């Protein structure tokens, strides 16, 4: 045929920046470029260069020499135009008792981008107010105008249509075989690696698809882990409960991998930190040296516990042995490169901001190499090998002291900055082996084998089933 019609189901909400339009749905401007790469990769049996030669032979490319684009047209349209609108934040907040029927909240999520939308600011969607009752509860108010003028919204739609048109019949038949696997292997949105934007193919040309998502994930990803998540659901019922539990679990488990968990009597060390201590180079946190250097200038950092220095039941030291020094590197860069670190000085209006900028100006960003997939309320953690380019690269840290001005007769006045407070920094320490430099050896499969086989008190911290290791 020349037209391929498919119906897509949505498992997790998508974070759309063009939520204002009633016709807003999955943008083909990011589905077609990704689908073209997927099809070429599968055409070359795991490689992309032989796949484009296959499409070059079959005359499936728009340009035979320049790009990966295939000659087909993509059109994603909403069938029924009713949406469920979600507010996705990282901080828990009380729920207002006045909302539109389609307004839902995901409380503890890995989406730390619209955190200012809940709080004191008059531009916030939910205004937090101290309770007129006992000063323990907090009151929430829904500001409709502020809701409308939000940049990103979480949108979930009823089943909609993806239409592919091409006069090349042989291309369409190949697209048909790979389209179901494409939606099982990819997520869309502004936080898609964390689980937002999970879609699956249900009907292709009015024919139901029987695609094993577990088998589909196995072929395309090097490792696949599945979580035994309890459902309760009362009895099905609340998807908001299911959504909130699933996304809270993802944030908890990911934050156990990168950095740790510090809330209660409970404390879980960074498994990424744990991995690098157990290997031969014995790298330690770059956070360790920042904390050491900031303490060197007598900055009272908040916390009653000295920084950890190893793996054992407790290694709470402020000093690094004596004969040699601990080997340092930028550990958490390979699992997502951040922009700045905050360290919460003692006086509760000032804090230390350390800024990472990359010395050569060659590494601006790094997407997380870990993909979280939520298909039918089941969390699948997949991934491939990390980008080896990030390994062994320099980073410059700018240590900045920030003190929040003690309010004003107006609003907060955080322009009271401070010049880069003086620190004894390193330049090329230990033959370019220092906390400036990313590690020179990392395998994601090896790391994830260590992570899901890691036990505290005889139980796995990340309760996952190793579908593929």
């Amino acid at each position: 045929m020349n037209q391929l019609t498919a119906i897509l189901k949505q498992h997790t909400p998508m974070i759309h920046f063009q939520h204002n339009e009633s016709g807003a749905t999955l943008r083909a401007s990011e589905v077609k470029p990704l689908l073209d790469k997927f099809i070429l990769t599968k055409l070359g049996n795991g490689d992309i260069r032989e796949g484009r030669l296959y499409a070059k032979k079959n005359n499936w490319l728009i340009d035979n020499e320049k790009n990966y684009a295939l000659n087909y047209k993509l059109s994603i349209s909403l069938q029924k135009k009713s949406r469920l609108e979600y507010l996705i934040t990282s901080s828990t907040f009380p729920l207002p008792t006045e909302r539109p029927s389609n307004f839902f909240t995901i409380q503890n999520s890995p989406y730390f981008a619209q955190e200012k939308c809940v709080g004191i600011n008059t531009n916030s969607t939910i205004i937090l107010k101290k309770s007129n009752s006992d000063p323990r509860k907090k009151e929430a108010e829904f500001k409709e105008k502020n809701w409308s003028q939000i940049d990103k919204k979480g949108l979930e739609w009823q089943d909609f249509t993806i239409k592919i048109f091409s006069l090349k019949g042989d291309l369409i038949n190949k697209i048909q075989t790979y389209l179901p696997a494409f939606f099982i292997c990819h997520n869309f949105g502004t936080r898609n690696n964390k689980g937002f934007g999970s879609f699956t193919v249900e009907y292709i040309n009015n024919q139901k698809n029987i695609c094993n998502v577990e088998d589909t994930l196995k072929e395309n990803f090097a490792f696949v882990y599945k979580k035994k998540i309890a459902l309760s659901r009362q009895s099905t019922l609340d998807f908001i409960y299911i959504y909130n539990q699933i996304f809270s679990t993802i944030k908890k488990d990911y934050q156990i991998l990168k950095s740790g968990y510090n809330f209660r009597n409970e404390y879980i060390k960074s498994l990424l930190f744990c991995y690098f201590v157990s290997k031969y180079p014995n790298y330690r946190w770059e956070k360790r040296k920042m904390k050491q250097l900031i303490k060197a200038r007598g900055y009272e950092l908040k916390g009653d516990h000295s920084p950890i220095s190893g793996i054992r039941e407790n290694d709470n030291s402020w000093n690094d042995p004596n004969p040699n020094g601990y080997n340092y590197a930028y550990i958490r860069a390979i699992l997502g490169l951040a922009e700045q670190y905050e360290f919460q000085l003692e006086t509760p209006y000032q804090k230390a901001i350390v800024k990472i900028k990359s010395a050569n100006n060659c590494i601006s960003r790094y997407k997380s190499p870990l993909l979280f997939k939520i298909i039918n309320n089941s969390i699948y953690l997949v991934g491939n090998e990390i980008n080896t380019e990030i390994l062994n690269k320099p980073f410059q840290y700018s240590y900045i002291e920030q003190t929040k001005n003690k309010n004003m007769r107006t609003g907060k006045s955080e322009i009271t900055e401070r010049t880069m407070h003086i620190n004894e920094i390193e330049m090329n320490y230990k033959n370019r082996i220092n906390y400036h430099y990313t590690p020179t050896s990392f395998s994601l499969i090896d790391f994830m084998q260590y992570a899901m086989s890691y036990k505290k008190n005889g139980k796995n911290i990340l309760n996952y089933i190793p579908l593929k290791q």
């Binding site: 063009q18 749905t25 943008r27 401007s29 005359n59 993509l74 059109s75 601006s364 960003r365 790094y366």
Partner: protein
Amino acid sequence: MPKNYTLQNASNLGWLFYKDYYRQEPNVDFISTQGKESDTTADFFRKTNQRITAYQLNSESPLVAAFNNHFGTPLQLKTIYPGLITGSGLPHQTGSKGEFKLGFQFDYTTGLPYIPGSSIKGTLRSMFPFSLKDKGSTKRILPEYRKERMEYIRDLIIEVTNINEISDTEIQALEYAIFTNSTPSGKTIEFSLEEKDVFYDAFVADSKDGVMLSDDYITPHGENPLKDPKPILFLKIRPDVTINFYFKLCTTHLYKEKVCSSKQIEEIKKQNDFSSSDYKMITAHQKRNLFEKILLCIGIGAKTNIGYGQLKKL
């Protein structure tokens, strides 16, 4: 002034987009590299963009009514999300932040967003087999192109008209009659004035409850995944905007796989060696239905491979 475009209270949208866009204000400074990235420049361009995107169009507009009176009954279709882009290659760029970096096709006199008739003609011809020129460079892709497009056109003609069989030579003759008003060899058929197929400029006719223009983003992430992507902001026609397609189409007569004029076909009818087997007719209504089906299949405008410019029935 801000909404309900009209002829008495409006600014020319094309003027606003092209000449007044980079007006030199007392304190803006987008000449310098520092000022191109500043918040003052971003605010300036944000205000200009808000002015451009604040206009709506009423169905009972004297402008569109005059278009209907001049060019005939419009073919009315609706834009679906993401919208419609036309004139994307027109140079509108300086290197500033918050600026529209893609061109837009604006009518000069009226300022209304419009799709030129040449764009419509080319988009309709593209799905006819004999649209790719026989060249040395195009010789390798010519046969498959013609085969695919001829099967598509044959199915469309059988669906729209009451023609049961159409031949490849008949499709060639029909396409050359519609788009060139000539024989496939290049010869001319003595046609009357009313026997010319004309593709007028499409116009925006109704915005309904919203505006007819909006802003959209394309963020090309580079080949290097470790480097920051560049956001590009451009102007689009909003979804659910009525587009009036104006045509002047005639009836095409086909006798013995050649295209005949009206007096020619009547003379042939009066002949005693006349058979209905080799006489074929596609009327202006059927031609308009065929064009409508082509437009609903492939859409119109720029970036149609990624969903921009797809149309729906009212």
